[PDB]
């Protein structure tokens, strides 16, 4: 596309600049361009891809939630205000779905199939789960069940690899488990599964902290605290 004429390294450089400038739409476009060069991504480059799209979709999700809340209130004693709330919620929703589809497209063409190391494959499968989960957040139709199942299937594949190939303190493994637990609680109507996963993940990570350097310890304990925060919220 539009980034076809720019060097891979220049796209990566500009993604980093865009991050510094809090220009996340630009950052995402640069990283899409980099992915479309066809080479595999390093860990740092996967981080750039992740940060860019998370920030873009994060803003869309926040906006969608505001508009959905206004829409719900409109449908309670409420005075008729016409189609505008629904239309605008739909506009934001369509854009959000578009971003999710873009990310899923990159993963399918061809990041996942070329990812053979545990860190890359688990990261990409987690990402696939996450973006299906974001699609599930706004789904209501004939397809909501299939979207949920797609998220589940991606997370489960990631989980299976992570358990076999990574230590329990690995940040990617931990972040995957965190997000899959959120899936269970928020999407799949499975709070007990969520709690069980968060508890087991936390406990197995705790038991492996002794193997870590000071820096790795910092990384693992940060995510462990998020598991604990959710457990506190959920129980």
């Amino acid at each position: 596309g539009a980034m076809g004429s720019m060097e891979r390294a220049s796209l990566i450089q500009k993604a980093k600049l865009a991050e510094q400038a809090e220009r996340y739409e630009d950052m995402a476009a640069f990283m899409k361009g980099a992915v479309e060069k066809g080479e595999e991504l390093s860990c740092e480059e996967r981080n750039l891809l992740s940060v860019a799209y998370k920030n873009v979709v994060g803003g869309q999700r926040a906006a969608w939630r505001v508009l959905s809340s206004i829409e719900q209130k409109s449908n309670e004693g409420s005075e008729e205000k016409g189609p505008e709330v629904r239309e605008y919620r739909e506009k934001v929703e369509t854009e959000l779905q578009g971003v999710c589809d873009t990310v899923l497209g990159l993963l399918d063409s061809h990041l996942i199939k070329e990812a053979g190391d545990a860190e890359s494959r688990v990261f990409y499968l987690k990402m696939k789960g996450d973006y299906y989960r974001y699609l599930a957040e706004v789904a209501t139709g004939d397809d909501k069940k299939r979207i949920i199942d797609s998220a589940r299937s991606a997370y489960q594949e990631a989980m299976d690899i992570s358990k076999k190939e990574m230590p329990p303190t690995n940040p990617i493994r931990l972040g995957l488990a965190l997000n899959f637990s959120v899936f269970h609680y928020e999407i799949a109507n499975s709070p007990e599964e969520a709690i069980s996963l968060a508890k087991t993940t936390f406990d197995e990570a705790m038991a492996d902290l002794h193997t870590l350097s000071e820096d790795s310890y910092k990384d693992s304990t940060l995510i462990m605290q998020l598991l604990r925060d959710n457990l506190t919220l959920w129980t």
Binding site: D130, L178, V182, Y185, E186, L226, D229, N230, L233, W234
Partner: peptide
């Protein structure tokens, strides 16, 4: 209150 998922780092 919403559950926390993995943040950016």
């Amino acid at each position: 209150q919403r559950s926390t998922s993995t943040p950016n780092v």
